[PDB]
């Protein structure tokens, strides 16, 4: 079982390969809308989410809980 600071690390490493976004505009707390993901990409990550922590998501899950911080918290805490 992935700690919150395990998963937001596995986000920002997410975000990071998916926008080529140099690290230092990829925190915790930035809200979501500026990291320009597609939301085609926002949807697939909460699929790839459902494979790695096992559980039912829904499909808009990164924008509900939008930041790296919120998303992680809500996802080990349900
Ligand atoms: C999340 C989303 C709705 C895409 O939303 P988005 O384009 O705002 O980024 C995607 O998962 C989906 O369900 N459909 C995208 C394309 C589609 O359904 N129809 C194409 C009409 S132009």
Redesign the pocket.
Known sequence: AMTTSQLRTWLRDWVLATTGLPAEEITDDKPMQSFGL???DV?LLSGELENLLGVKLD?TIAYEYPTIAALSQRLIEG
């Open positions: 597609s939301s085609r949807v499909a």
